[PDB]
């Protein structure tokens, strides 16, 4: 029905006003054929930073906006025309291109500062890290401030926290920047959605955080993989599959063909499988039978009561404050300070193709590894013309779970 299906590459989940986030969007269409550099018209709307550009070869392009706007910032791009002009009066009529229809809402910072963080939201090198980077600020510079402030970086691990690590540095009284050094390692022992967190340990009583997360793709605590005697002809019975794990670990010998698995490949059969086969991983904020609360505070006077420049009953908003940024990871906490917005209590006036090969069993058994790696003999099932595997698996408490994911013998 639609043509030219665009994207949202690395756009802001949400954003804040004192820093220009960079929008990024890509495209794919037809044969997978976005033109390298066909022009667009980048819809700066209500911030009015209209700034046309074009793709790269990937579809990708990077673009930002200016800063000076209310929460209600509406942002998008179009690439072709807008309305349904041609031969369109029949009611058996429609013709569309994709909408880059993105929105978001705004920090409620009567705290007036925040942190602006950048992503990992893509493929990942594990057992690694990188100099983590965000953008800091401070407000009125600092009104009175201090010499330093502590920035100890929370990381919501497995529905809670696991690691310990601190940061913090000087305050200059009346000048701000947006640079901050930090880094955290990617190992294991972790709910595999990487929920970083960081804030100012404020004396005047407020916190600055959000859903500002990363990824934890397939990487393991205990490793194991294999090595075998070669693909050989009919009588090559005496073979091997030498596989190597921790010193003391019960492990498997499931040497196998793979054709009848090419019929139904490893659908629920992987390390990401054993990751997400966990239950109740990150039940966050307000779960199923879970809700917000009536903070006894109220902004109730007997009339509509907005000052400033307008008659307005207390301007019914829908945006993002910090008590929900306590919700968006999954934890509770306690806090005397002012973290939640002033919503009031209402007044008296206003309220398949079947592709099978022969079935007989080849190898299925268990050994235990040693400090040197066992070299178990795979034994051949001749009269079998195909590509093969050993879907093994190992485990122990001295090392944790591990798996030989991928190998091939024809």
């Amino acid at each position: 029905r639609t043509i030219t299906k665009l994207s949202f590459v690395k756009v802001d989940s949400h954003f804040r006003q004192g820093i220009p986030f960079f929008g990024q969007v890509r495209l794919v269409d037809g044969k997978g054929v976005p033109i390298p550099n066909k022009v667009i018209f980048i819809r700066g709307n209500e911030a009015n930073y209209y700034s046309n550009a074009t793709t790269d070869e990937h579809g990708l392009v990077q673009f930002s906006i200016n800063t000076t706007n209310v929460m209600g910032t509406s942002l998008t791009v179009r690439v072709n025309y807008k309305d349904r002009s041609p031969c369109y009066g029949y009611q058996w009529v429609s013709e569309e291109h994709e909408e880059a229809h993105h929105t978001a809402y705004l920090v409620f910072s009567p705290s007036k500062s925040f942190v602006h963080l950048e992503p990992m939201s893509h493929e990942l090198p594990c057992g690694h890290t990188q100099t983590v980077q965000a953008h800091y600020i401070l407000n009125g510079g600092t009104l009175l401030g201090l010499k330093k402030l502590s920035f100890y970086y929370l990381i919501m691990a497995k529905g809670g926290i696991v690691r310990t690590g601190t940061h913090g540095l000087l305050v200059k009284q009346e000048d701000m920047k947006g640079h901050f050094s930090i880094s955290i390692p990617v190992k294991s022992d972790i709910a595999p959605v990487a929920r970083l967190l960081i804030y100012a340990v404020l004396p005047t009583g407020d916190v600055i955080g959000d859903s500002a997360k990363y990824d934890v793709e397939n990487c393991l605590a205990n490793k194991v993989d294999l090595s075998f005697s070669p693909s050989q002809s009919l009588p090559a019975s005496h073979a091997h599959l030498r596989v190597t794990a921790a010193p003391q670990s019960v492990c498997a010998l499931r040497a196998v063909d793979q054709s009848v698995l090419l019929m139904k490949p490893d659908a629920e059969l992987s390390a990401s499988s054993v990751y997400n086969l966990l239950p109740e991983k990150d039940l966050t904020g307000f779960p199923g039978p879970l809700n917000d609360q009536d903070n006894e505070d109220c902004i109730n006077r007997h009339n509509v009561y907005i000052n400033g420049i307008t008659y307005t009953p207390v301007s019914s908003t829908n945006e993002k404050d910090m008590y929900s940024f306590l919700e968006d990871m999954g934890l509770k906490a306690f806090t005397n300070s002012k973290i939640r917005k002033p919503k009031m209590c209402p007044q008296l006036q206003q309220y398949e193709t079947v592709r099978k090969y022969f079935p007989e069993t080849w190898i299925w058994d268990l050994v235990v590894v040693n400090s040197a790696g066992v070299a178990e003999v795979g034994v051949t099932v001749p009269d079998t013309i195909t590509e093969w595997k050993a879907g093994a698996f190992c485990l122990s408490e001295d090392a944790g779970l591990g798996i030989s994911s991928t190998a091939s013998l024809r």
């Binding site: 039978p289 917000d292 609360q293 009536d294 006894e296 109220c298 509770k332 209402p346």
Partner: protein
């Protein structure tokens, strides 16, 4: 459900009102679900209004009566589960929450909208715990309850009956023995008793100006509060003192006199909680085979009286007078089942 238990507890029931009440319960339950939330919660409207948030005092009532209604017939556990945990998450850092005001009626909740007695409604309604569990939610209700008690008792005025009486019965089904005792004993000082009974009253000349018709904006919550006054005394998981039973039948003489010819009382809250207070007063004093309460007086002037009370001579008033100027008539009571006497 409370009158179902009340009629059954008295033992003058019938399995026909029972079975047609099975029908009542199924239909009414289901129609509660007509107006609940897709998440578990409960508002007045529910379906066709997807985006919404339930009601607090409402949901307290619904968990309470889900407790007791399961306590008579079959329910499904997920309802009490999801609702108990609704009130459990109704919890940011510290505060004692208030009504998420979406009422259509300020009288169905006989209270006066303070988070004080709201929160105290939470703690009682979530501690009375018939045969299920009440895990997280209710103790921090006790915690805020102690907090508001500190705010009040450090003062001297919270309407002088209402809030501290709710503290009494809250601490009671908690069993904060010294603390329930302190607050109900202050109440015992702050006495508004009847010439034949006992009862309590908010100022009745309230400090803020009042209205015209039934004193609007204020249900006056007497039979609910005075029940919640009545309710503190009967509570002890083995037994309270018999002083509790005395004051109970005093304040319940007041209850039954404050009732009117139709049914229930001047709200639903007062009616529910009165009937349940009365029912479990009975559940203390009533057992099937226990119908053997024997009696004597023993006055030294060869002028005393033996009596007996049972299940089938179960309630004849024995109007009996005395010749002596003083009354030096030593009681005695043996057997099974409790009795109400009134001397003057």
């Amino acid at each position: 459900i409370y009158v179902l238990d009340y009629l059954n507890e008295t033992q003058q029931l019938t399995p026909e009102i029972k079975s047609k009440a099975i029908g009542y319960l199924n239909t009414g339950y289901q129609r509660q679900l007509n107006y609940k939330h897709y998440d578990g919660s409960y508002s007045t409207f529910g379906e066709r209004y997807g985006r919404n948030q339930g009601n607090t005092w409402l949901t307290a009532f619904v968990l309470k009566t889900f407790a007791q209604a399961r306590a008579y017939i079959f329910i499904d556990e997920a309802h009490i589960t999801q609702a108990l945990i609704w009130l459990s998450q109704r919890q940011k850092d510290n505060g004692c929450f208030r009504s998420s005001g979406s009422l259509l009626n300020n009288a169905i909740k006989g209270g006066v909208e303070d988070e004080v007695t709201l929160s105290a409604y939470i703690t009682i309604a979530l501690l009375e715990i018939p045969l299920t569990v009440t895990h997280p939610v209710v103790r921090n209700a006790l915690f805020c309850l102690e907090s508001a008690w500190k705010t009040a008792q450090e003062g001297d005025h919270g309407s002088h009956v209402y809030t501290k009486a709710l503290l009494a019965y809250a601490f009671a089904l908690a069993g904060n023995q010294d603390k329930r005792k302190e607050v109900l004993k202050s109440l015992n000082e702050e006495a508004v008793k009847k010439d034949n009974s006992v009862h309590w009253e908010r100022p009745q000349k309230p400090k803020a100006p009042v209205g015209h018709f039934y004193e609007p904006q204020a249900p006056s919550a007497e039979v609910e509060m005075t029940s919640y006054v009545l309710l503190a005394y009967l509570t002890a998981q083995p037994a309270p003192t018999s002083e509790d039973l005395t004051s109970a039948t005093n304040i319940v003489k007041w209850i039954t006199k404050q009732q009117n010819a139709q049914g229930g009382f001047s709200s639903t809250q007062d009616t529910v909680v009165a009937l349940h207070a009365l029912s479990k007063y009975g559940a203390a004093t009533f057992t099937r085979t226990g119908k053997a309460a024997q009696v004597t007086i023993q006055s030294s002037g060869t002028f005393s009286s033996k009596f007996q009370v049972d299940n089938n001579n179960r309630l004849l008033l024995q109007q009996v007078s005395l010749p002596e100027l003083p009354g030096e008539y030593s009681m005695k009571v043996t057997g099974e089942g409790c009795v109400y006497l009134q001397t003057s």
